[PDB]
């Protein structure tokens, strides 16, 4: 039973980074050379594990997280980073064991005159914990006065839309990202590389 990484990387629709998706992959085998020997990725960087050793290892569980961000924000998808994405949208732990994979998706996620459907969280009271998801749309209390659910002074809607236009510079183009987390708990391994 081949691991279903295909329906993550080749999915037709990707989610907004604030509402990043997660697929739990278990009880399967996979040849990871299909990924790290692919010419389709502009970023393929692993932490705590070398890509060329993935096929020698088994893990209790593997998570595959996916989302869309800007090109010059792919740097934030790494351990120990800061910024609106790492702080408020998708946060990797310091001791991350996994791989970050990204590729330019201007042809799929942009529209002449702007694609506006991809969003990110711009305001948040605190930084996300590692691997935390926050999809709430409560009004952000920028000051000390309660907002009571009302947009106004010091009370901001927390989400902001990317403006993905084909003519944007590369740093402002959309990039699809897949984060693979390899976890080894005190429990039977079930996901093995080949």
């Amino acid at each position, epitope marked *: 039973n081949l691991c279903p990484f295909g329906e993550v990387f080749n999915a037709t629709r990707f989610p907004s980074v604030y509402a990043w998706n997660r697929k739990r992959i278990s009880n399967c085998y996979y040849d990871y050379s299909v990924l790290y020997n692919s010419a389709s990725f502009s970023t393929f960087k692993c932490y705590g594990v070398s890509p060329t050793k993935l096929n020698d290892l088994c893990f209790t569980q593997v998570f595959a997280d996916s989302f869309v961000i800007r090109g010059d924000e792919v740097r934030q998808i790494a351990p120990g980073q800061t910024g609106k994405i790492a702080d408020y949208n998708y946060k990797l732990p310091d001791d991350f064991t996994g791989c970050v994979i990204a590729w330019n998706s201007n042809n799929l996620d942009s529209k002449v*005159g702007g694609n506006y459907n991809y969003l990110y969280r*711009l305001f948040r009271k605190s930084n996300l914990k590692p691997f935390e998801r926050d999809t709430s749309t409560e009004i952000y209390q*920028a000051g000390s006065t309660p907002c009571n659910g009302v947009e106004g*002074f*010091n009370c*901001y*809607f927390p989400l*902001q839309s990317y*403006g993905f236009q084909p003519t944007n510079g590369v740093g402002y183009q959309p990039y699809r990202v897949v984060v693979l987390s390899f976890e080894l708990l005190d429990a039977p391994p079930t996901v093995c590389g080949t």
Partner: single-chain antibody
Amino acid sequence: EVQLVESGGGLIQPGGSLRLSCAASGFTVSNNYMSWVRQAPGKGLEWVSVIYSGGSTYYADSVKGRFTISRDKSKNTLYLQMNRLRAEDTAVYYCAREGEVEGYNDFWSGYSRDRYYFDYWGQGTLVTVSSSALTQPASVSGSPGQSITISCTGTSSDVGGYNYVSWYQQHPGKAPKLMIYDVSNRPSGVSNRFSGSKSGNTASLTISGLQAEDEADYYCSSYTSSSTRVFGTGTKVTVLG
């Protein structure tokens, strides 16, 4: 390249309905607070409605229960539905955008949606229906190369409650142009001859080295404690000679 292009104006009978459109480009209509501002023939600017990033809408009492502001994000378009129309609604209608979350790119001020100044305007569309305000002096004049000052009194609830006073220049037949924001700040590209200040409930615009091109109508505007906006009555600046 930010642009706001309006359409839908026309002559309609009292009691009729009309929908105005404001097609935006260069930015996402949901990423900025969008307002409609109208101007009756020969009169001053009147703010009437705004829509916030989360969809919240606020209205001037003069249009409550009759006008509805909305947007279509797929069309990047802002709308004003005008029902139960009155002859007093005859005016040029402008759509206007408020500031970017980052403010201006040449100065670090963090991120905030408290950016209360109309930095980009549509060209205006006239609606003819045919079968309050901050205090400004009616007219001010000065000699070429000299300085004049324009006052703008409000209340604890707007000019004197916040440092969110902005000033606009309007030539005949043209949309207003932002000259000063946040009381004393100048956008890039606006002449250093324009400056702004405030004391108590009165804001002031000073134009130095007056030139013939400075002849125009000038309006102040303020955020209000009701999350609305309010324009001054307008000042006609005359450059002698």
